[PDB]
Paper text:
Platelet integrin αIIbβ3 is maintained in a bent inactive state (low affinity to physiologic ligand), but can rapidly switch to a ligand-competent (high-affinity) state in response to intracellular signals (“inside-out” activation). Integrins are αβ heterodimeric receptors participating in cell–cell and cell–matrix adhesion in metazoa. The β3 integrin ectodomain comprises 12 subdomains assembled into a ligand-binding “head” that comprises a seven-bladed β-propeller of the α-subunit and a vWFA-like βA domain of the β3 subunit. The integrin ligand-binding site comprises an “Arg” pocket at the top of the propeller domain and a metal-ion-dependent-adhesion-site (MIDAS), normally occupied by proadhesive Mg2+ ion in the βA domain, flanked by two regulatory metal binding sites a ligand-associated metal binding site (LIMBS or SyMBS) and an adjacent to MIDAS (ADMIDAS), each normally occupied by a Ca2+ ion7,8.
Full-length αIIbβ3 bound to the partial agonist drug eptifibatide undergoes dramatic conformational changes in the integrin that may contribute to the increased bleeding seen in treated patients. A third finding revealed in the eptifibatide-bound structure is the large conformational changes in the full-length αIIbβ3 induced by this ligand-mimetic drug. Surprisingly, only the headpiece without the thigh domain was visible in the cryo-EM map of the full-length αIIbβ3-eptifibatide complex, despite the lack of evidence for proteolytic degradation. The absence of additional features corresponding to the leg domains is thus most likely due to drug-induced conformational flexibility. The map at the overall resolution of 3.1 Å shows only a density for the integrin αIIb propeller, βA-, hybrid- and PSI domains of the headpiece, but densities are not visible for the thigh, leg, and TM domains, indicating that these domains display conformational variability. Eptifibatide’s homoarginine (HRG) makes a salt bridge (red dotted line) with the propeller’s D224, and its Asp (D) monodentately coordinates (red dotted line) the Mg2+ ion (cyan sphere) at MIDAS. The present structure also indicates that the αIIbβ3 TM and CT domains do not limit the global conformational changes induced by eptifibatide and presumably by other partial agonist drugs. The magnitude of these conformational changes makes it less likely that a complete switch of the integrin back to the ligand-competent or inactive state is achievable when the drug disengages from the integrin.
Author numbering:
A (entry chain B): 59 to 72, 79 to 432
B (entry chain C): 1 to 7
C (entry chain A): 5 to 452
Write the structure that this text describes.
């Protein structure tokens, strides 16, 4: 029983040769047993989906340009950090209802900046703008297009915007086989749960999506703001890591806020975004992968077993996958195959596919 | 800000 | 537990958003429940102060006849307009002898004079019902011919336009009504106190703008630490200066000092006797306040709700349940200090501590006992009302009785409740619970 190595291209270290060797011819005699060691290494970069939420209030006006930069710059950095990226975004002002807006004179419903003789867009709960896409150019163009609206009071409904950013997928366009990051902007205090009771809204924000066709938070005027708890539930359940990118004015408020939400971080949204981009790459440093193998196109008659040697260099029998691999680590698997006699087919072909790897070990087997 | 105004 | 007495309202009406008790000079006790979206005779949701008489079966209530027509009064080259469109006539109700004060926080109000106007801002307005005399007076201490430009020019000093006056309201034992408008002074908040007798005497039909001589509006402030706190979102009255000759005002602002939230104790003359600050940020420390002698030593103690409080538990998890802060008044002329006791809910996302109902004493003994709300508590996530059997030392962390929502999802059962009032005169307070989402109110006649 000799196993001739056919395709043995070396592992890349970033062809993206993620499995070595690639093709093997296995020759067997009746009642035979034989073990060979394969090696596998992650090569290509990691997948990521960034959603971006922005204030649009009269207030936000002071730092509007600021938050716009925090979009585009961010994308650029994660273009240099990975190739498998998607980016999407949404905007928000406050609950569209008195006393948060101006309703007199009636023109205020179309322009609540009547007293300043200026034009501001009719203020809105949450208007989801761009679904997540690899088209970063379209994301940049749509982010820059957003402009300022008006409300009455200083706090704004950002938590409503985050809940509707994470709470639905099809509208927003996430990927199950990827990491998720959510960057939230503001410059003033945030309307939290129980703020909307000033406008007659006493029904909470639940864990369901209320955006349909019009690209608006339909149930904005009838659903209250969301609390930090349900925020955390929706961030964790969907595997979303939050970064509060806020102005230095009351950055302590959001540092305390981040202490209040497990796993989230806070950046000083300002003239620069170093404090936020460094935290982006920090969160990117913590992504751990898994190398798990399956075997396809093999009959039941042939029996198989294995050992495994991971990055820890500790040999384990019966464990086909270690938890928490990184980029560049090599894992070896010694597979033992036992054949019971010579079948009539006399020539088989099967695959060993690492889970989530398009590359596979194609094995041709002959019996003498 | 006291209201939606620039500080 | 069978006598879960149901009071019904029409669809849309939000029957139960606010509630209180009334005892006319005739002596008939009625549940006054405000449905802020009741359909008027003009097929418009404005508000309805359902004077529900105490009926075992409950059901639809006789909508007490409040003037729903908008007054386009003319005086001094000005037009006083009281926009009652979506006014919420019923988002806060109180009573005192044969007087019912039923306040529309969203009763928009305006002055048309040349091009300028007062802006239809939810100044609020308490309708004064004297049903025995049939006197339909009106009160709005916040109602003001002051133009928008005048308010802007003075850095919004005393900017009362957005009062939502009658957002909360209490009646002083002496007979003067104190209304808490969190929207006061540009959402800073304020208290406006005036006798009911004086406003009744000063009332004239179709005037809607008249200075009341005995009104007492709160002093505004300029320290940013009070900004957007909603200094008045919750209001109550207790004695904290140890001087029974004056009445002390306890104000809960749940967003005080950047979402920390506080409760201030002031004298009758609107001067700070003390301030008590929030432990956990964004927990809404001051959403609901409650003044009572939980200790029962003769000195009033303060109870604050924090319905967005999140605790730390095993595996280092921050689970959002809520909290109740109890501050105890020290013996003699001593100021209140650190949170005397701390009480916490169990169910996740329950908004535990949204509404606190002073229950007085449950077992008719002497330990002051209270109740607290959790509109989305319980295993199901529908509603929860938790009875805190208080102690001579303070408040126990394990609620004695938990009432679950018999309504479906979205009802916000327990969101506004009230006790301390005996309906059947059995000698025990009766807990009335305003499940607004289902347009119903549940009265539980608590047997100890
Ligand atoms: C109170 O609660 C809610 C809040 O308003 C109400 O819910 C809405 O009520 C309207 C009633 O006008 C309802 O419209 C009905 O739709 C039916 C079709 O599903 C209509 O046809 C009926 O179909 C029956 C099934 O075959 C048939 O047997 C019957 O003869 C009739 O033809 C019906 O006539 C109504 O127009 C809305 O669907 C409903 N919407 C929601 C979102 O709830 C509720 O009705 C109110 N209940 C009461 C008792 O007042
Ligand atoms: C959220 O961020 C804020 C800043 O934005 C952090 O505020 C910090 O709060 C601490 C106190 O928790 C401050 O330390 C001291 O505070 C006292 C004032 O409080 C005292 O209170 C007791 C009773 O509670 C009274 O008896 C005293 O008289 C007194 O009033 C002050 O006197 C000290 O000099 C000292 O400042 C700290 O200063 C403050 N930091 C800033 C930058 O303002 C807050 O910690 C943070 N939240 C959490 C949970 O960390
Ligand atoms: C991979 O591990 C398996 C067992 O999981 C190895 O089989 C062992 O071979 C040795 C002889 O060298 C025997 O003494 C053991 O009894 C066998 N199995 C076990 C687990 O005890 C197999 O040989 C390993 N492959 C390599 C590369 O050595
Ligand atoms: C194969 O298995 C034998 C025992 O079964 C072991 O001694 C040897 O180290 C293994 N590896 C190879 C590929 O020979
Ligand atoms: C209480 O106030 C009244 C009203 O002025 C006063 O006449 C009375 O003397 C006061 N009583 C005490 C004990 O101070
Ligand atoms: Ca700004
Ligand atoms: Ca606002
Ligand atoms: Ca006093
Ligand atoms: Ca006491
Ligand atoms: Ca007792
Ligand atoms: Ca009773
Ligand atoms: Mg703003």
């Amino acid at each position: 029983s000799e196993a001739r190595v056919l395709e043995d291209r070396p592992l890349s270290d970033k062809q993206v040769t993620q499995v070595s060797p690639q093709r093997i011819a296995l020759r067997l005699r009746p009642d035979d047993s034989k073990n060979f060691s394969i090696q596998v290494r992650q090569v290509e970069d990691y997948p990521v989906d960034i959603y971006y939420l922005m204030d649009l209030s009269y207030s936000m006006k002071d730092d509007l340009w600021s938050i716009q930069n925090l979009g585009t710059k961010l994308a650029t950095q994660m273009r240099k950090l990975t190739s498998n990226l998607r980016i999407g975004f949404g905007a928000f002002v406050d609950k569209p209802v008195s006393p948060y807006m101006y309703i007199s004179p009636p023109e205020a419903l179309e322009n609540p900046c009547y007293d300043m003789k200026t034009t501001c867009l009719p203020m809105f709960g949450y208007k989801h703008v761009l679904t997540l896409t690899d088209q970063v150019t379209r994301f940049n163009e749509e982010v820059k297009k957003q402009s300022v609206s008006r409300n009455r009071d200083a706090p704004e409904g950002g938590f409503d915007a985050i809940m509707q950013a994470t709470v639905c997928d099809e509208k927003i366009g996430w990927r199950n086989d990827a990491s998720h990051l959510l960057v939230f902007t503001t410059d003033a205090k945030t309307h939290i749960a129980l703020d909307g009771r000033l406008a007659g809204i006493v029904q909470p924000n639940d864990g369901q999506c209320h955006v349909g066709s019009d690209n608006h938070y339909s149930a904005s005027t009838t659903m209250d703001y969301p609390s930090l708890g349900l925020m955390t539930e929706k961030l964790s359940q969907k595997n979303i890591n939050l970064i509060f990118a806020v102005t230095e004015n009351v950055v302590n408020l959001y540092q305390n806020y981040s202490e209040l939400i497990p796993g989230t971080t806070v950046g000083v949204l300002s003239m620069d975004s170093s404090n936020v981009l460094q935290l982006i790459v920090d969160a990117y440093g913590k992504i751990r992968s898994k190398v798990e193998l399956e075997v396809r196109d093999l009959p039941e008659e042939l029996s198989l077993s294995f050992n495994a040697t991971c990055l820890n260099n500790e040999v384990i029998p019966g464990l086909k996958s270690c938890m928490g691999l990184k980029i560049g680590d090599t894992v070896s698997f010694s597979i033992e195959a036992k054949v019971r006699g010579c079948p009539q087919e006399k020539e088989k072909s099967f695959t060993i596919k690492p889970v989530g790897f398009k590359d596979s070990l194609i094995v041709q087997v002959t019996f003498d | 800000x006291r209201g939606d105004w620039p500080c | 537990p069978v006598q879960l007495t149901f009071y019904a309202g029409p669809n849309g009406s939000q029957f139960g958003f606010s509630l209180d008790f009334h005892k006319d000079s005739h002596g008939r006790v009625a549940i006054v429940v405000g449905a802020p979206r009741t359909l008027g005779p003009s097929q418009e949701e404005t508000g309805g102060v359902f004077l529900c008489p105490w009926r075992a079966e409950g059901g639809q209530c006789p909508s007490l006849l409040f003037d729903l027509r908008d007054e386009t009064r003319n005086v001094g080259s000005q037009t006083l307009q009281t926009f009652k469109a979506r006014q919420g006539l019923g988002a806060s109700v109180v009573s005192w002898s044969d007087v019912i004060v039923a306040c529309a926080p969203w009763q928009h109000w305006n002055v048309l004079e040349k091009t300028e106007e007062a802006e239809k801002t939810p100044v609020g307005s308490c309708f004064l019902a004297q049903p025995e005399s049939g006197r339909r007076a009106e009160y709005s201490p916040c109602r003001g011919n002051t133009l928008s430009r005048i308010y802007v020019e003075n850095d919004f000093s005393w900017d009362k336009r957005y009062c939502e006056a009658g957002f909360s309201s209490v009646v002083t034992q002496a007979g003067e009504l104190v209304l808490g408008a969190p929207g006061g002074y540009y959402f800073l908040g304020l208290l406006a106190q005036a006798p009911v007798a004086d406003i009744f005497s000063s009332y004239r039909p179709g005037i809607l703008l008249w200075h009341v001589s005995s009104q007492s509006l709160s002093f505004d402030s300029s320290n940013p630490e009070y900004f957007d706190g909603y200094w008045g979102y919750s209001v109550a009255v207790g004695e904290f200066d140890g001087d029974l000759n004056t009445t002390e005002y306890v104000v809960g602002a749940p967003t005080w000092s950047w979402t920390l939230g506080a409760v201030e104790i002031l004298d009758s003359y609107y001067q700070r006797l003390h301030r008590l600050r929030g432990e956990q940020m964004a927990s809404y420390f001051g959403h609901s306040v409650a003044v009572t002698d939980v200790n029962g030593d003769g000195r009033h103690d303060l109870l604050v709700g924090a319905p967005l409080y999140m605790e730390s538990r095993a595996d280092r998890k921050l689970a959002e349940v809520g909290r109740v802060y109890l501050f105890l008044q020290p013996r003699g002329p001593h100021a209140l200090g650190a949170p005397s006791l701390l009480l916490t809910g169990t169910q996740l996302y329950g908004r535990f501590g949204s509404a606190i109902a002073p229950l007085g004493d449950l077992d008719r003994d002497g330990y002051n006992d209270i109740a607290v709300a959790a509109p989305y508590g319980g295993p199901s996530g529908r509603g929860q009302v938790l009875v805190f059997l208080g102690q001579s030392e303070g408040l126990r962390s394990r609620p004695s009785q938990v009432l679950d929502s018999p309504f479906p999802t979205g009802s916000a059962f327990g969101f506004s409740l009230r006790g301390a009032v005996d309906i059947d005169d059995n000698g025990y307070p009766d807990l009335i619970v305003g499940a607004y989402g289902a347009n119903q109110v549940a009265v539980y006649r608590a047997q100890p």
